[PDB]
């Protein structure tokens, strides 16, 4: 039984992340992993979209702890952002790990795309 201070960013953000973790579990996505994203989109009836790709960054600001992902579709260069705490995703699967010496793979956009096909 304690009254609360003006530190409500951390407790709204903390209980938001704890509620979204209570809904679905999420293992942590470090930068450089090769992961899958299973997305729920209505009216398509397939209800499990395929998003393979390589995480480029993690702009973690509490409930927007996000994923900058990249996969070469047969045309070119698709770069999708994912909020990890959104109710629209279903599960994540850390398939591989590049073991890259960088926190921000923005060089890898405009490189040779044989090193970017998931």
């Amino acid at each position: 039984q304690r009254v609360k201070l003006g530190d409500i960013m951390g407790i709204l953000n903390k209980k938001a992340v704890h509620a979204a973790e209570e809904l679905r579990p999420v293992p942590g996505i470090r930068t450089g992993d090769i992961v899958q994203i299973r997305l729920e989109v209505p009216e398509n009836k397939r209800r499990l979209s395929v998003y393979k790709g390589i995480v480029i960054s993690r702009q973690n600001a509490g409930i927007h702890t996000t994923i900058r992902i990249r996969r070469i579709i047969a045309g070119v260069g698709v770069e999708i952002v994912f909020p990890l705490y959104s109710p629209n995703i279903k599960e994540i699967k850390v398939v591989s790990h590049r073991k890259v010496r960088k926190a921000r793979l923005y060089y890898l956009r405009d490189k040779l795309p044989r090193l970017s096909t998931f």
């Binding site: 609360k4 003006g6 409500i8 960013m9 407790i11 709204l12 953000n13 938001a16 979204a20 729920e40 509490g62 409930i63 927007h64 909020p83 705490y85 959104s86 109710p87 629209n88």
Partner: protein, 212 residues
Amino acid sequence: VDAGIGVMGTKLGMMSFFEEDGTVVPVTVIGFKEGNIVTQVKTESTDGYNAVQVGYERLRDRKLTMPERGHLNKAGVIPMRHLQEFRLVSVDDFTPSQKLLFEELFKEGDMVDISGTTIGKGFQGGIKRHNFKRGLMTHGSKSHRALGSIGAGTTPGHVYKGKKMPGRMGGTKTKIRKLKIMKIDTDLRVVMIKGAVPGKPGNLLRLAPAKI
């Protein structure tokens, strides 16, 4: 003339509410340091208009002068810093004796207006106050970013008043309008409100229902 009494609260950062439908909305978080106690009502009898005078930010008595604290102890309430009224039509039932009004009156009313001191930017130029254009950056030009022509020729002989000059941009209060309410917290004393209030986290903020 406002359509009802409002409250005032302080801004405490911004975040994103995740709606269970799947959308991501950017909300501002509102706290409440102390309850918005009605301190002084001014009716049609003893005043030319009708308004309900509330206040905010209970403090130490050293922080508050003798006319202020004498005015607040005339109502028999706590000594508090901020103090504003809302002008309201003559159907009011408000006692000035310590009406610690609770914040339930805004959730069903999914439209609210907010006023606040925007962040000041000091003496800024005409390129950002009034959204001008700059000159040519090159091609031998010399009037980069400058104010350009100011008036017409000989026949005015002066410049028109209210002409767009550089000056102090921010610092005055603004009201942004019809902002739809969202998830209140009956224990965290925190109201989500989808929008962008005027000012950084910490300032006073009028939170009063709409006037459409």
